[PDB]
């Protein structure tokens, strides 16, 4: 059946903005997962999970009699698709159970692990999400084997369809680099926003870079991918050594014995895949990655044997039974247990990528300290495992249940507690009046609040106006934020705040974060008034102000908007058309197409553009909140042509006279071109639409202002 994507393969795609509708959701519209989880008997689930670890099923027999390793692997893959560049991936939505992740080659046989979990998911039903369960299972596996975890938070609600993520352009699973859709260029530079070396891998190739078994060069790939998942050297060493304390790899026979991945398998396979023709197909004969490595003498017990072996032996290159490169300690005795035959033992083995921890010089220092000081290794691994599995969960206010760690970590972008009464409605009105009396303009007010709030991304729930991090490094100096203009606005708002707080009794105070938002609300109210409409913009206090010391500057970098079509801003020149970047930003802000459309057309005429550019400012009453953008954009009396200077800027001239009326960018003019967006623009540009425009604009503005307000959830 030929589709629109087939006829017009480069048209913009809006269906990313309408995923996750009420239509696809089997739960009622009022279902609240946090309420369900908060009444779950978590202790009882964990007891069930404990028992499962050593209850072997014949259709996928447990190695060593214990599923713990398989489950740690499962939970680390659940979390391990995360990319800091856009916050997509991670464990937070349980996406491992949907395409394409359920069928990535790095997730081979995790379909078995997920299936083992069904009886428990079934027992507790909607009170524990799959997303929570994958992670909880990994924790319980660690605990069952003697490892003390740092804690666990619930609150990952399940999702019901695949997320739309760019995982790369290769059309072949695992394609080595250098092909026609290579994700590398230059001196081994991986394209943003990717965080893996080959399509269908979690991070790196366990045999080495493009299969070359050189630990040193494999370390460079480890470091790069891990950094693109927000982990530094110490965290990376702790995570890899920690995880490979447990279990084993599977490569009992040649890879060609393994059949179709789950999305390709027959219907009778009932959602499982990688069925193997090698011997029994499972257990002692299992083939997963094609490597055959068991790291430690006690694969079902926490120990410090991974570093004892890594440093204690000299290693030589050998091949698994499937032909993959791996390493053996030939000088060793057969000290490693066999997974099923109590009468067999094996020599110690390692992956290329494990040897990286000893032969990369920066890693060796850390490895050695963890070898000599295994308590430091256990503490690091516990912290990094928590971070790994909670990195995309958002503000601590979303964390549920009795096991949440009390320690506040810098990576969580922490917000201080509020310990004082909040402003009320009359106070908000008085502050809005003081703000407008200061001389700050509609444009200044709207721009500053937009800049503060629109760093939010729903992918990992980082960013937003809570914290007032706009006033701190590095946000204050981001080019999009107009650093000198922003400094003048913030100074005036801070003086207002100081005056208001100084006049209060009884501990009542307003935060700067709240005032930035409220002042943007005043700007929108005044814009509506400029257009002859009295409206009240809703405003919810309770934001707090974070300090510089509570703000990791390096980790904030990935939130910098380099493209923000809402402010007609592009930091430099990109391969991807600006309209594509606009939809991407909309998806991250959780906006539908209609909400995107209303919001942009309003911001244009409020003076939100960076630099006060006239591009898209299709009004003669700037700073009045009207539907002028759409009425003028859709006026057939105006003809548009790309400029000679810049093919991405367009001039709109009167069709009869040739007089120049407006200029625009691709972001502006897509609303008059794309057939779905233009149908939207038509609604808002019609003669009956002034009231609808204003209401829908105020509603989306308020949505944006509240994106990180999980304290009010």
Position 175 contacts Na ion (CB under 5 A): no
Q: Which helix (H) or strand (E) holds 148?
A: none
Position 641 contacts a second copy (CB under 8 A): yes
Helix (H, G, I), strand (E, B) or coil at 79: helix
Q: Which of residues 183-242 bind ligand HEM (CB under 6 A)?
A: 203-204, 206, 222, 239-240, 242
Q: Which residue in 697, 460, 683, 695 sits closest to 591, CA to CA?
A: 697
Residues 6+ apart with CB under 8 A from 353: 204, 205, 206, 208, 215, 218, 222, 240
CA pair distance 533, 522, nearest whole angstrom? 13
Contact partner, 162, from ligand HEM, Cl ion, a second copy, none, Cβ < 5-8 Å per class: a second copy
Q: Please say whether the beta carbons of 570 and 581 come within 8 A.
A: yes
CA pair distance 587, 592, nearest whole angstrom? 8
Kindly tell me which residue out of 63, 86, 143, 170 binds a second copy, with binding defined by CB under 8 A: 170
> Binding segment for a second copy among 45-53, 91-99, 297-305, 417-425 (CB under 8 A)?
91-99
Contact partner, 392, from Cl ion, Na ion, ligand HEM, none, Cβ < 5-8 Å per class: Na ion
Position 88 contacts Cl ion (CB under 5 A): yes
Position 461 contacts Cl ion (CB under 5 A): no
Position 325 contacts ligand HEM (CB under 6 A): no
What are the tokens at 678?
């233009």
CA pair distance 431, 437, nearest whole angstrom? 10
Position 460 contacts Na ion (CB under 5 A): yes
Q: Which helix (H) or strand (E) holds 453?
A: helix 442-453
Query: How open is the CA angle 152-155-159, to the nearest 5 degrees?
Result: 125
Q: Which of residues 64-103 bind Na ion (CB under 5 A)?
A: 87-88, 90
Kindly tell me which residue out of 33, 45, 60, 73 binds ligand HEM, with binding defined by CB under 6 A: 73
Question: Measured in Å, how far apart are the chain's first and last C-alpha atoms?
Answer: 44
Q: Which of 66, 77, 304, 325 is catalytic?
A: 77
Contact partner, 88, from ligand HEM, a second copy, Cl ion, none, Cβ < 5-8 Å per class: Cl ion
Asked if residue 620 has a cis previous peptide bond (ω within 30° of 0), the answer is: no
Q: Please say whether the beta carbons of 385 and 142 come within 8 A.
A: yes
Q: Which of residues 608-637 bind a second copy (CB under 8 A)?
A: 634, 636
Kindly tell me which residue out of 103, 289, 454, 597 binds ligand HEM, with binding defined by CB under 6 A: 289
What are the tokens at 169?
């352009």
- Catalytic: 77? yes
Position 210 contacts Cl ion (CB under 5 A): no
What are the tokens at 251?
């490569």
Backbone angles phi, psi at 268, to 5 degrees: -70, -20
Q: Which residue in 441, 572, 419, 605 sits closest to 506, CA to CA?
A: 419
Q: How many residues bind Cl ion (CB under 5 A)?
A: 3
Tell me whether residue 231 is exposed, middle or buried, using C-beta atoms within 10 angstroms of its C-beta: 0 to 12, 13 to 18, 19 or more: buried
Kindly tell me which residue out of 25, 48, 163, 308 binds Cl ion, with binding defined by CB under 5 A: 163
Least Å distance between CB 76 and ligand HEM?
A: 4
Backbone angles phi, psi at 431, to 5 degrees: -65, -40
Q: What is the DSSP string of 558-585?
A: GG--SEEGGGTEESS--SS-HHHHHHHH
50 is in an annotated binding site: no
- Identity of the residue, 360 or 514, whose beta carbon is nearer to ligand HEM in the bound complex: 360
> Binding segment for a second copy among 241-249, 251-259, 322-330, 592-600 (CB under 8 A)?
592-600
Kindly tell me which residue out of 102, 198, 225, 626 binds a second copy, with binding defined by CB under 8 A: 102
Query: Per-residue x/- mask for a second copy, residues 7 to 26, rule CB under 8 A?
Result: xx--x--xx-xx--xxxxxx
Query: Per-residue x/- mask for a second copy, residues 232 to 271, rule CB under 8 A?
Result: ------------------------------xxxxxxxxxx
What are the tokens at 195?
């965080």
Least Å distance between CB 159 and Cl ion?
A: 8
Residues that bind Na ion (CB under 5 A): 87-88, 90, 392, 459-460
Residues that bind ligand HEM (CB under 6 A): 63, 69-70, 72-73, 76, 203-204, 206, 222, 239-240, 242-244, 246-250, 288-289, 291, 351, 353
- Active site residue ranges: 77
Annotated binding site for heme b: 244
């Amino acid at each position: 059946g030929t589709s629109n994507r087939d006829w017009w393969p480069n048209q913009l795609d809006l269906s990313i903005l309408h995923r996750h509708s009420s239509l696809s959701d089997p739960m009622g519209k009022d279902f609240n997962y946090a309420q369900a989880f908060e009444k779950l008997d978590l202790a009882a689930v964990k007891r069930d999970l404990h028992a499962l670890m050593t209850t072997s099923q014949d259709w996928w027999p447990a190695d060593f009699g214990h599923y713990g390793g398989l489950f740690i692997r499962m939970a680390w893959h659940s979390a391990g698709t995360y990319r800091t560049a856009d916050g997509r991936g991670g464990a937070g939505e349980g996406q491992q159970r949907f395409a394409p992740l359920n069928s990535w080659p790095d997730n081979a046989n995790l379909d078995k692990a997920r299936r083992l979990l069904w009886p428990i998911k079934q027992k507790y039903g909607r009170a524990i999400s799959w997303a929570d369960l994958l992670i909880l299972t990994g924790n319980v596996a660690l605990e069952s084997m003697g490892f003390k975890t740092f804690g666990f938070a619930g609150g990952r609600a399940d999702t019901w369809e695949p997320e739309d993520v760019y995982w790369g352009s290769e059309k072949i699973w695992l394609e080595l680099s250098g092909g026609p859709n290579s994700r590398y260029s230059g001196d081994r530079q991986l394209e943003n926003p990717l965080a893996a070396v080959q399509m269908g891998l979690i991070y790196v190739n366990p045999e080495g870079p493009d299969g070359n078994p050189d630990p040193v060069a494999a370390a460079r790939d480890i470091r790069d991918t891990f950094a693109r998942m927000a982990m530094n050297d110490e965290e990376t060493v702790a995570l890899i050594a920690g995880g490979h304390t447990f279990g084993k790899t599977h490569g009992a026979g040649p890879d060609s014995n393994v059949g179709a991945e789950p999305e390709a398998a027959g219907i009778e396979a009932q959602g499982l895949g990688w069925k193997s023709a090698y011997r029994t197909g499972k257990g002692a004969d299992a083939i997963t990655s094609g490597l055959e490595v068991t790291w430690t003498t006690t694969p079902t017990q926490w120990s410090h044997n991974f570093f004892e072996n890594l440093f204690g032996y000299e290693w030589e290159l050998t091949k698994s039974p499937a032909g993959a490169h791996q390493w053996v300690a030939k000088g060793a005795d057969a000290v490693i247990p066999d997974a099923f035959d109590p009468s067999k033992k094996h020599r110690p083995t390692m992956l290329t990528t494990d040897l990286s921890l000893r032969f990369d010089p920066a890693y060796e220092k850390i490895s050695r300290r963890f070898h000599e000081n295994p308590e430091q290794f256990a503490d690091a691994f516990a912290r990094a495992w928590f971070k790994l599995t909670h990195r995309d969960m958002g503000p601590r206010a979303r964390y549920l249940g009795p096991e949440v760690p009390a320690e506040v970590l810098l990576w969580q972008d922490p917000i201080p507690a509020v310990d004082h009464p909040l402003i009320d409605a009359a106070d908000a009105a008085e502050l809005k009046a003081k703000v407008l009396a200061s001389g700050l303009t509609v444009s200044q007010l709207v721009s500053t609040a937009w800049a503060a709030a629109s760093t939010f991304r729903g992918s990992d729930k980082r960013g937003g106006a809570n914290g007032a991090r706009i006033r701190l490094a590095p946000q204050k100096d981001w080019e999009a934020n107009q650093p000198e203009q922003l400094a003048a606005v913030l100074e005036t708002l801070e003086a207002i705040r100081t005056a208001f707080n100084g006049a209060q009794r009884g501990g009542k105070q307003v935060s700067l974060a709240d005032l930035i938002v409220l002042a943007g609300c005043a700007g929108v109210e005044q814009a509506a008034k400029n257009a002859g409409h009295a409206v009240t913009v809703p405003f919810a206090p309770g934001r707090a102000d974070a300090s510089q010391e509570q703000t990791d500057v390096e980790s904030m970098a990935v939130l910098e908007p380099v493209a923000d079509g809402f402010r007609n801003y592009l930091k430099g020149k990109y391969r991807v058309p600006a309209e594509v970047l606009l939809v991407d930003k909309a998806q991250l802000l959780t906006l539908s197409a209609p909400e995107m459309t209303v919001l942009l057309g309003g911001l244009r005429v409020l003076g939100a553009n960076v630099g006060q550019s006239r591009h898209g400012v299709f009004t003669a009453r700037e700073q009045a909140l009207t539907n002028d953008f759409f009425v003028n954009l859709l006026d057939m009396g105006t003809e548009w042509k790309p400029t000679a200077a810049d093919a991405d800027v367009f001039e709109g001239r009167d069709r009869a006279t040739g007089e120049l009326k407006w200029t625009g960018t691709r972001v502006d003019l897509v609303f008059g071109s794309h057939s779905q967006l233009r149908a939207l623009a038509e609604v808002y540009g019609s003669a009956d639409a002034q009231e609808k425009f204003v209401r829908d604009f105020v509603a989306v503005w308020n949505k944006v202002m509240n994106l990180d307000r999980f304290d009010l959830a």
